[PDB]
Design a protein around this ligand. Structure first.
Ligand SMILES: [La+3]
Ligand SMILES: [La+3]
Ligand SMILES: [La+3]
Ligand SMILES: [La+3]
Length: 513
C-alpha cells in the first residue's frame, strides 16, 4: 500500500503512455528510439544522436542506462519537465536575434509612469518601482520631473496625490540596475516640469550619476538611421524635448527628441526624422490604426513610436499591447506594477530573445514598402496559415492559492490565441473538481492562425467558483515562434510573473501548415 500510495500519488499514466509509445515493448529508450521520438513527436529540427545523447547525459538518472546510452521512464519524465521539455523554447531564452538593426526595428520593453507602485491618483511612488521594472527586463522607463524642496527635483505624478521621490535617488537605482537583466540600451523618458534652475540640477545629476553610461553624443557614423541595440549596448539614452528648456538637458537628447505627432509621409518630409519620437495615447493609437494602419506601420519602420495608457486608467489597469505591436509600435508602455493578462502577454513577448528587452520585429514590419495592415489582411508574406492543435492533458501541483487550508482547487484551463484580430480566439476545458495535484483533462483544441508571426499562445489556469469570480491559479504566454512541439510541460507563473517551481501543465502541441 505504501509503495502503492507513495508511487500512485506519484503516478502519471499520460507519461506512462507517452513512454510506452516511444519505447514500445522495451523498458528503455535506446538512442535510436529517442531520436525517433525527438523527430516524430517533439519535432526537433536538430534531432539526431547528438541531441539524444545530450538529453540522456543531462537527464537520465540511471547510471546503467546513462552509461549504456539509454533513457528510462524516469529520465523521460525529467527531460519532459526540464528546460528542454519546456513548451517555451529553451533556444529562445538566450539572445539569438539580430541585434544590429535600428532601434525602430525591435519591440522594446517599456513601462509607464515607472515610478508608481499602485494607482495614478494617490498611491505611492518609489525607486523600488524602477528596480522591479528593470529586473523584469524593462528597457524604457518614465520619469516625471517636478521642482522639489532644496533645489532637488522630485518625481511624482503631476497634479495628483501620488507620493514623491527624488530624481537623484531614482538615477542611482537606475544606474545600479539598468543592466542586471540585459546589456542592451535603457531609454529614460523625461517629462520635464522643472524650473530652469532645477533642470540644471537634473543635468548635473544625470552626468554625475550616470557618468559614462549616459549617451551624450551621437555615435560615429550614426547618421541616417537610429543606432542598433548593439551599437548602444551598455548605454542609457534620454528621450525628451529638445531646443523653457536649458541647454544642459536639451543637449543630452540625442536620438529621441519628443515630438508631436505630425502625420505619416516619408519622402524626406512630414513623417518625423529617425531621431524624432512621437507618443500616442491608447485611444489615438487605436484610431490611427483604425484609419491609417499601413501608414503607421510604414511609419514605425524607421521611427520609434510610444503608446501609453488612456487617462481614464487611473487604476493603473493596462491595455492590450498586441494591438499596438500589430502596427509595429515599439515603445508600448504599460503599467508594470499591474498584474493581468496584459502584463502576462507583455512579459511573455519579452521572455523571447533572451529577455534582453529588444525583440526583432517580423520582416514585413521592417519593410518600408509594406502593404501590411493587420486590420485589412491581404496576401503577403505575413499570410501563412497554420493549424495549431493543443491537447491539455493534465496538470501537476497547481498552486493552491487563496484559502489557507479549507478547500481544494477546482481547476479548468483556458487557451487563448493573441495576435491579429482574425486570429484571436479562446477555448476552455471542463472543470475538474477538487484536484490541483494532478487534474487530468485530456482535452484538445484547434486553432487556425493566419499571421503566426504576430501571435502568442496563452495558457491560463483558473479555480472555478460557482458563487464567485474564478480565482487565477497560474498562467504562461508563449510567442508563436517559441512554442515547442510534442509533449511538453507548461511552467505556470503567478499573477506577479513569478515562477511556480512545481506547477505545470502537461500538453501536446502540434503545428501543421
Ligand atoms: La508621465
Ligand atoms: La473545491
Ligand atoms: La473552487
Ligand atoms: La476559490
Amino acid at each position: 500500500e505504501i509503495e502503492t500510495f507513495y508511487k500512485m500519488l506519484t503516478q502519471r499514466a499520460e507519461i506512462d503512455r507517452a513512454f510506452e509509445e516511444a519505447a514500445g515493448s522495451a523498458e528503455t529508450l535506446s538512442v535510436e528510439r529517442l531520436v525517433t521520438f525527438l523527430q516524430h513527436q517533439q519535432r526537433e529540427e536538430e534531432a539526431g544522436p547528438a541531441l539524444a545523447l545530450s538529453l540522456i547525459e543531462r537527464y537520465e538518472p540511471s547510471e546503467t542506462a546513462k552509461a549504456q546510452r539509454q533513457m528510462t521512464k524516469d529520465g523521460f519524465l525529467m527531460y519532459l519537465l526540464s528546460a528542454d521539455g519546456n513548451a517555451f523554447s529553451l533556444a529562445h531564452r538566450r539572445v539569438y536575434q539580430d541585434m544590429d538593426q535600428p532601434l525602430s526595428h525591435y519591440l522594446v520593453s517599456s513601462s509607464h509612469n515607472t515610478y508608481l507602485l499602485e494607482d495614478q491618483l494617490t498611491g505611492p511612488s518609489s525607486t523600488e518601482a524602477y528596480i522591479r521594472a528593470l529586473c523584469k527586463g524593462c528597457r524604457c522607463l518614465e520619469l516625471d520631473c517636478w521642482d522639489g524642496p532644496n533645489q532637488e527635483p522630485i518625481i511624482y505624478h503631476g497634479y495628483t496625490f501620488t507620493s514623491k521621490i527624488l530624481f537623484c535617488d531614482v538615477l542611482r537605482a537606475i544606474r545600479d540596475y539598468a543592466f542586471k537583466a540585459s546589456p542592451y540600451p535603457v531609454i529614460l523618458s523625461l517629462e520635464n516640469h522643472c524650473s530652469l534652475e532645477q533642470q540644471r540640477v537634473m543635468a548635473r545629476h544625470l552626468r554625475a550619476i550616470l557618468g559614462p553610461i549616459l549617451l551624450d553624443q551621437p555615435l560615429d557614423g550614426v547618421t541616417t538611421s537610429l543606432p542598433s541595440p548593439e551599437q548602444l549596448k551598455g548605454k542609457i539614452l534620454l528621450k525628451g524635448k529638445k531646443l523653457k528648456l536649458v541647454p544642459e538637458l536639451s543637449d543630452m537628447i540625442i536620438y529621441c527628441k519628443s515630438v508631436h505627432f505630425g502625420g505619416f509621409s516619408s519622402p524626406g518630409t512630414s513623417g518625423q526624422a529617425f531621431y524624432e519620437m512621437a507618443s500616442f495615447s491608447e485611444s489615438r493609437a487605436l484610431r490611427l490604426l483604425q484609419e491609417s494602419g499601413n501608414g503607421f506601420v510604414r511609419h514605425n519602420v524607421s521611427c520609434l513610436s510610444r503608446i501609453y495608457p488612456a487617462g481614464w486608467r487611473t487604476d493603473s489597469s493596462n491595455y492590450s499591447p498586441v494591438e499596438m505591436w500589430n502596427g509595429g509600435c515599439q515603445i508600448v508602455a504599460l503599467n508594470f506594477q499591474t498584474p493581468g493578462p496584459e502584463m502576462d502577454v507583455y512579459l511573455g513577448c519579452f521572455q523571447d530573445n533572451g529577455g534582453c528587452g529588444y525583440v526583432l520585429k517580423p520582416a514585413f514590419l521592417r519593410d518600408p514598402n509594406t502593404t501590411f495592415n493587420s486590420r485589412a489582411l491581404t496576401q503577403g508574406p505575413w499570410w501563412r496559415p497554420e493549424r495549431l492543435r493543443v491537447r491539455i492533458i493534465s496538470g501537476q501541483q497547481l498552486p493552491k492559492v487563496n484559502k489557507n487550508k479549507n478547500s481544494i482547487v477546482d481547476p479548468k484551463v483556458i487557451v487563448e490565441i493573441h495576435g491579429v484580430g482574425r486570429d484571436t480566439g479562446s477555448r476552455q476545458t471542463a472543470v475538474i473538481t477538487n484536484n490541483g495535484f494532478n487534474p487530468r483533462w485530456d482535452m484538445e483544441f484547434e486553432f487556425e492562425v493566419t499571421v503566426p508571426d504576430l501571435a502568442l499562445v496563452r495558457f491560463m489556469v483558473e479555480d472555478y467558483d460557482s458563487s464567485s469570480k474564478n480565482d487565477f491559479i497560474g498562467q504562461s504566454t508563449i510567442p508563436w515562434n517559441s512554442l515547442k512541439q510534442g509533449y511538453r510541460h507548461v511552467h505556470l507563473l503567478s499573477k506577479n510573473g513569478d515562477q511556480h517551481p512545481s506547477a505545470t501543465l502537461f500538453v501536446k502541441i502540434s503545428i501543421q501548415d
